[PDB]
Paper text:
The sole target for neutralizing antibodies on the virus surface is the envelope (Env) protein, a homotrimer consisting of three copies of gp120 and gp41 subunits that are associated by non-covalent interactions. Methods enabling the production of stable recombinant trimer immunogens based on the ectodomain of Env have catalyzed recent HIV vaccine efforts. Hence, the efficient trafficking of Env trimer immunogens to follicles following immunization is likely essential to promote optimal humoral responses to HIV. Here, we demonstrate two strategies to concentrate HIV Env immunogens in follicles, via the formation of immune complexes (ICs) or by employing self-assembling protein nanoparticles for multivalent display of Env antigens.
In this platform, the full-length ectodomain of Env (gp140) is genetically fused to the trimeric component of the nanoparticle and the fusion (antigen-bearing component) can be expressed and purified independently using an equivalent set of approaches applied with free soluble ectodomains. A variant of BG505 SOSIP, engineered to have increased soluble expression (see “Methods” for details), was fused to component A of the nanoparticle (T33_dn2A). An initial cryo-EM reconstruction of the entire nanoparticle verified the appropriate assembly to the target tetrahedral architecture with four BG505 SOSIP trimers flexibly linked to the nanoparticle core. Due to the flexible nature of the linker connecting the BG505 SOSIP antigen and T33_dn2A scaffold, high-resolution reconstruction of the entire nanoparticle as a single model could not be performed. However, focused refinement in combination with partial signal subtraction allowed us to treat the nanoparticle core (consisting of T33_dn2A and T33_dn2B) and the displayed BG505 SOSIP trimers as separate subparticles and analyze them independently. Using the approach described in the “Methods” section and Supplementary Fig. 3a, we reconstructed a 4.6 Å resolution map of the nanoparticle core and a 4.5 Å resolution map of the BG505 SOSIP trimer. A combination of Rosetta relaxed refinement and manual refinement in Coot was applied to generate the atomic models. Importantly, the structure of the scaffolded BG505 SOSIP revealed that the antigen remains in the native-like, pre-fusion state and that nanoparticle incorporation did not interfere with its structure. Thus, formation of protein nanoparticles with as few as four Env trimers was sufficient to significantly alter immunogen trafficking in NHPs and increase delivery to B cell follicles.
Numbering used by the authors:
A (entry chain E), E (entry chain A), F (entry chain C): 33 to 140, 152 to 185, 188 to 309, 312 to 323, 323A, 324 to 397, 410 to 506
B (entry chain F), C (entry chain D), D (entry chain B): 520 to 550, 568 to 661
Write the structure that this text describes.
């Protein structure tokens, strides 16, 4: 007795994967022409109503199957390459250099004094160039001869000194026909249904921060530290630990650098490290010990709900790999740091700052994204760098190999940058609206 | 009350808000070579989806309606629930889960009943 | 019976299958920088062609119909064949060959008759 | 008499020529990588604008009309001029200047009156 | 008692900015494969009805807010760069050269005889190259050594010898939904309402002519010289003077040049100036004095309606700047000329040709558009160049600093190429058609 | 008494030219990342109903006016260039080399032993490189000095050793609104009406095979050999001969090559021919004589229906031109062969394999498509190549100059690659569906 009735404009949707548009936060800060993110995401935001609650609607979320992480990965890499693309190349620097130790005010030889004949603006002439280098960028050929470490593998391009990569919050917005569903459940662990759901046109602004083994400058958890993993019991997976409190880390590049330049072609400029004013000190980062200790104790209270509260949680340092794998990698003041983390994971829990200083390495040729391809050269920065970042979470793995002794070992995980972006993206899902549908009614079409 | 603001509403109550979703299909009105192509492709895709919904309504004889009664009887095999539950207790999202496997059946039937009636109109004239 | 499966059918028989061709206009629903542009351009072109057919039907007052009678009389100068041959012996492809030079005449006349009638409706209201 | 040939005509006289402007929306039918993208983007933009006009007419219940009477009363606050001036002395461009600040009011009201009537039709059936 | 009635297809419009399509004039002249404009604007015109009058419609125009000038600027530059892009680069020529004076039949030393070892098709060999250069492209390094003047600033690319940049008339056409409104009012001064309005699908064909301090080959004013300015009383703005009569200017490159070539890589060809047959003469341009005098007197009659007819109009030469700023810059026969203008502005008006010859400089490395970036190298032209152009207008500024003495000084303005294009564009406006609208009627919808 | 009735969805169409989408055959074979065609036509096929018969519909076909050949030409070339584009360039190899004859186990000197100083990864050093070359790639400069033959004309780029160009069947699919009409008439000669017509969404898969003077690996004719020409009686046109039986041709590169490599820049790798293990033999191809003889006799039976069965058909070899013109050119095992064909056309017909071996030349610098532009360098292949291809047709021309003696001479034609693709494309036509149309009915619109 019922008939099909067709309804158009029906408030339903399906899981969907599309490309979101990016926007800067209404260009609140112009950045002039010196910021890559601001330049790319030139599109403004608008402080319109931000969300629509969906009462009585339960939606299923899974942060490890969230394609927005793939979009950020793709867009971040793509922009970085477009940014570097028009800059001056360093092919002319793939030469043999003669090097000696730098001994001036040095207690540890991290730097080498190297020199070579560099191409000048005329093809007929070369300029003798003398500058200091970090050992991490220099390899012996065999007052020995050395070369740039990557000149056998790929081209090296100098980053334009005029372009900052400083993260700005970026909002991602749905295309017409799409909506983003946001989970506000304070207890959401990254997988399953969420009842506290509202929709948005755009995500809030997320900074495109890149780091290894430690999550920086993200949002904080409410009430408790939340540990999220696709597979908690799998020692092969990274567990993302979101703190409900931040910890500050104070990093520096203490050597007062004097930057020198040279014309190496027709308007082709190269910037070199020059020399250091004053004495030499290792790059380093400082963390208050008690704060760190409290932070791990909080992490332990949470690990225990997954592994047993009769357990022993042991922390340990990185198991092995390259700097890009084992150290805490971050950009500070525009420079690239590779810091030790082992002093942070030297304790176990068994069921006047007094800070810890972590030594750091400085490297100028960057194997960005751990991708085989062109390397970036980071031009030197004049003066001294100091910055303070917010530790907002950790990335850990277990060693496994357990015999159920109740003692488990946790070490820095890291690797894939996607896992940092997941820290904010776990809250959002993209769906496609499907407005056309049918239902039975007690109504036959009138036929005329 | 917002796009999908009716998502938790009963189907009856939600049918009274259909213009809310219809108007969000062409929101592109309000809205670097490689990047620009992908941005443009997205607009083209949204247009094709819009047009397909309109074509289907067109073929079924509902081109100008948000709600239309048709000449296809309801199959209890698709759903044997009464209309009272469907319209007063259940929401549209739940309903979609209940009958999604018959989408293509219903649509094929709608095309057939309308084609037959259009022929009848032409023969009557 | 397939797209253009009615191509060898008489015009009458073929008119009963019009939904078959209508549904193949938006088949893009089911469906490297330089290459991608050309691939995208093709979709845009298909959309404009679709829209033009719809606009013409719109203007002529046949926006919701596959078949519509109009207010333009048939000219024997376009074709002096009887309807019996046209509908029962001849196919649409053959018919197109018979009257293609008048396409623009008929269409202009359709626009004029509908514009006059729409004015009449507004004056009557 | 040409696109916008009626621009200096009175609104009444100009309403009799509405098919003239409607037919110029899809003129793209008659109509280097970086350049080609910009050329293509222009076509996509024209399509979205076309579709939005059609959607609005659709929602308001005027999907098949060039001219339609509606269920929204005229507010003297938008314009307190009589119809005689509006239709016989004034042109459409002048009229647009007279009421452009109410465009969104009238359109919102049109959506509301049509939604109410469509519900009434469904309840009556 | 009145109801809203909705009307679709309403003949109204709004000011709008879009991109117009360009077309050649129906490819009336093929140009084969040797013309850049013809190649880009491959789209034909059609001599269909050209215009629709809009009786009783008044439209407001403003030539200084007309976005079509921006489009021409963008398209002209973009095409020029795409045209140059695939041509052979001159990076191999950024060498040190030894130079001596050219003294052969010279009364003024404009040319230098320079030589160097140039790269040949094999990487193992160089060819000694000897050629003559204009001093404007040559800078001393310090029988002294010299270099190409721009090799410290940017790459130099040779224009393909096969591609002409000769302006062809280009029509600009509206996208669907857009229309171009044309003002035919003979008294229109560039700003305000126009009643003589008609619409077109496309503008007439405008040649993409580039010049400094003098408008060439444009249309003429009817009845009187018309002086147009965004701000007449502002001495900081250029006034565009459109003549109602043309003045011919006869320019030449009198030196019978012999062009020589060399292979400098794998199919990489370079063309050089070789030497000169016969004697040496300065490049120059000739203008009949009386015609010029009449022309300025006509300009003065018009200046007086803006500044007072009790005034004294004094003309003076360029105040300062580079050749690209102070001279009359134009392309003649494919060569780039920088001519003196001071002899043209040596008079004042107080309320058998007898021509004036203006000496000219020839330069081959062109800082096109006064943009910082790659330079173009203009290959030499075989033989002797003669051309005649039409002076159709002037670009002037006032010095200002006036004490209301009634004497005002006018000097060549120039600078921005946009101002030349404005000379034709002032007649046209782009609008968007808005077909959907409403009006009251004595008609309620019939409700069924 | 009849009125216009408008019908939408009418099954009619017009001849039309559009771009078809390409698809691999459902990625039945992955090819990993080593096949260019598979990579480009990433789009899968679907074994859905393949065709719709159109009973009582006659369609007119013309294989010489078929725009699908133009699309294949354009897409094949475009892909080939995109494939080569990112590979390492050989500009550094355009040097002078010293060469001597290779005499080691040689009875015929096809190879030369050449050496030079090649650029290494550092700009300061060169490596002496010794390798063997085929004479076809080497030209004397004048223990004499030689150069790469194309270094005076264009850049040479090394094909990536990781990318295969092995043809895969590619299907071409219609855009929405388009259909492809297929003629199944076994007697269709390439022009005129066909009654055996069905439509398809996509063509069957056609391999993008390139060859000169002999059609390879195409489909076979049924019942008889079919000779197709736009102009049978015109001696200036190629006649395409489609066999109804295949003939196998066994080709080899018998020299057991040892491949050597070198780093010539920052990850820039070059692969060279090294040397040969064992002795030296000419490249060659074998065809059974009797099979070939039968094949030509069948061709003759068909030529006689066009020229008279009282005729004498004489076959002769290529009349002249370069290897790319006169030889049988094909890719075998990835190598480029230029084989003699004259032994195949040494007979006339007058109204234990016993094979014929055709000597072949091997060339590494390829003037692909006979286009002026960049050359491709084919890196050497390790070991020995053997392959067997299917002769599926011939491309012939007549000499003409006939005095009606009844004896006509047929020689290899070739030239344009489009003619090979025509061998499959003759079966298909692209049309545009035009669903909107009118017809008279005895029905006036009801006016209300
Ligand atoms: C986590 O978040 C913290 C901040 O919350 C980030 O640290 C900040 O990083 C920025 C960028 O390096 C630092 O800003 C720099 O300050 C330098 C001088 O500071 C004084 O002057 C500025 C002027 O407005 C005042 O705002 C400031 O209070 C001080 O008075 C500037 O010289 C730097 O400018 C650089 O870029 C411009 C671009 O054109 C160049 O012209 C300059 O020469 C120079 O290169 C820059 O502005 C900021 O101080 C940092 N904060 C702290 C606490 O140190 C962390 O980096 C972030 N971590 C992660 C992982 O994202
Ligand atoms: C007409 O059609 C014929 C076939 O019908 C084509 O000839 C074939 O060409 C392919 C491509 O060169 C040949 O395949 C090659 O075989 C080599 C070894 O063969 C043995 O191992 C394979 C492994 O699966 C077995 O399938 C095969 O039966 C044998 O057991 C491989 O080493 C070759 O691989 C190459 O590419 C890969 C890509 O990553 C590289 O890694 C390898 O190192 C290597 O470079 C390749 O697979 C095939 O044998 C040929 N057939 C015949 C009869 O010889 C004609 O070319 C074709 N003609 C035209 C004009 O198109
Ligand atoms: C979510 O569910 C609650 C009930 O569980 C809905 O509450 C109803 O609200 C209407 C509003 O007039 C009342 O008439 C009903 O009596 C309420 N139900 C009950 C059981 O009291 C609420 O509206 C639902 N949310 C949405 C979006 O519909
Ligand atoms: C092709 O032509 C034949 C006739 O020449 C058509 O056959 C007709 O089929 C209908 C089917 O019911 C019969 O009623 C007719 O009597 C048949 N005709 C004759 C002369 O017997 C066939 O249908 C045509 N094909 C198409 C596609 O219409
Ligand atoms: C421009 O204005 C004039 C009047 O000022 C319009 O002239 C009218 O033309 C109609 C045509 O039938 C006559 O019936 C009217 O009597 C004329 N008006 C007067 C005052 O005589 C003219 O038509 C207007 N232009 C346009 C485009 O409408
Ligand atoms: C610096 O001194 C250490 C001491 O052993 C030595 O090994 C190293 O090679 C020296 N470096 C240079 C560049 O001399
Ligand atoms: C430049 O090259 C010479 C080799 O002839 C070398 O002695 C000199 O040290 C080089 N210059 C520098 C700064 O190394
Ligand atoms: C269209 O006009 C041409 C002109 O010769 C004519 O041959 C053809 O048959 C005409 N077609 C129709 C349908 O009248
Ligand atoms: C719109 O509002 C502005 C506000 O000052 C007013 O000046 C203008 O006349 C208004 N236009 C209409 C159509 O009411
Ligand atoms: C040419 O002669 C003038 C005369 O003073 C001199 O200054 C100039 O440098 C000379 N140029 C060359 C290249 O010798
Ligand atoms: C080439 O270089 C040599 C320097 O060894 C120089 O003497 C010679 O003059 C140069 N050739 C030319 C034409 O300057
Ligand atoms: C190889 O020997 C032949 C014999 O005449 C000679 O002509 C040829 O030039 C030789 N080639 C080389 C590289 O010596
Ligand atoms: C490298 O160049 C030198 C010239 O000084 C030449 O003698 C030597 O033979 C070259 N090396 C090779 C392998 O030809």
């Amino acid at each position: 007795n019922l008939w099909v009735t067709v309804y158009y404009g029906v408030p339903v949707w399906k899981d969907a994967e599309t490309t979101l548009f990016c926007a800067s936060d209404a260009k609140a800060y112009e950045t002039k022409k010196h910021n890559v993110w601001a330049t790319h995401c030139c599109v403004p935001t608008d402080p319109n109503p931000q969300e629509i609650h969906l009462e009585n609607v339960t939606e299923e979320f899974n942060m490890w199957k969230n394609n927005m992480v793939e979009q950020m990965h793709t867009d971040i890499i793509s922009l970085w390459d477009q940014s570097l693309k028009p800059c001056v190349k360093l092919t002319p620097l793939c030469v043999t250099l003669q090097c000696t130790n730098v001994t001036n005010n040095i207690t540890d030889g991290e730097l080498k004094n190297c020199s070579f004949n560099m191409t000048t603006e005329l093809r007929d002439k070369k300029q003798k160039v003398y500058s200091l280098f970090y050992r991490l960028d220099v390899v012996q050929i065999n007052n020995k001869e050395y070369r740039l470490i990557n000149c056998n593998t790929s081209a090296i391009t100098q980053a334009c000194p005029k372009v900052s990569f400083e993260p700005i919050p970026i909002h991602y917005c749905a295309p017409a026909g799409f909506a983003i569903l946001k989970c506000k459940d304070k207890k959401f662990n990254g997988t399953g249904p969420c009842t506290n759901v509202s929709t948005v046109q755009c995500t809030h602004g997320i900074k495109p921060v890149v780091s290894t083994q430690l999550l920086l400058n993200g949002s904080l958890a409410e009430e408790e530290v939340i540990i999220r993993s696709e597979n908690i019991t799998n020692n092969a997976k990274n567990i993302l630990v979101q703190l409900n409190e931040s910890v500050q880390i104070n990093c520096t590049r203490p050597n007062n650098n004097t930057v020198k330049s040279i014309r190496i072609g027709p308007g082709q400029w190269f910037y070199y490290t020059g020399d250091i004013i004053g004495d030499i000190r290792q790059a380093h980062c400082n963390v208050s010990k008690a704060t760190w200790n409290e932070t791990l104790g909080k992490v332990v209270k949470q690990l225990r709900k997954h592994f047993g509260n009769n357990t022993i949680i042991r922390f340990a340092n990185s198991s092995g790999g390259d700097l890009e794998v084992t150290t805490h990698s971050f950009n500070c003041g525009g420079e690239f740091f590779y810091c030790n983390t082992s002093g942070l994971f030297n304790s176990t829990w068994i069921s006047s700052n007094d800070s810890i200083t972590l030594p750091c390495r400085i490297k100028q040729i960057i194997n960005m994204w751990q991708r085989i391809g062109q390397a970036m050269y980071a031009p030197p920065i004049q003066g001294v760098i100091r910055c303070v970042s917010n530790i907002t979470g950790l990335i850990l793995t277990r060693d496994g190999g357990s015999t159920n002794s109740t003692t488990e070992t946790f070490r820095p995980g890291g690797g894939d940058m996607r896992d940092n972006w997941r820290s904010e993206l776990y809250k959002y899902k993209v769906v496609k609206i499907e407005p056309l549908g049918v239902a039975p009614t007690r109504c036959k079409r009138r036929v005329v | 009350l917002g796009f999908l603001g009716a998502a938790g509403s009963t189907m009856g109550a939600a049918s009274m808000t259909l213009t809310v979703q219809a108007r969000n299909l062409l929101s592109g009105i309000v809205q670097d070579t490689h990047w620009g192509i992908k941005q443009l492709q997205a607009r083209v895709l949204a247009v094709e989806h819009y047009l397909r919904d309109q074509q289907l309504l067109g073929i079924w004889g509902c081109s100008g309606k948000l709600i239309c009664c048709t000449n296809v009887p309801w199959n209890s095999s698709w759903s044997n629930r009464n209309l009272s539950e469907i319209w007063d207790n259940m929401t549209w999202l739940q309903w979609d889960k209940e009958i999604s496997n018959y989408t293509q059946i219903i649509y094929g039937l709608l095309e057939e009943s309308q084609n037959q009636q259009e022929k009848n109109e032409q023969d009557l004239l």
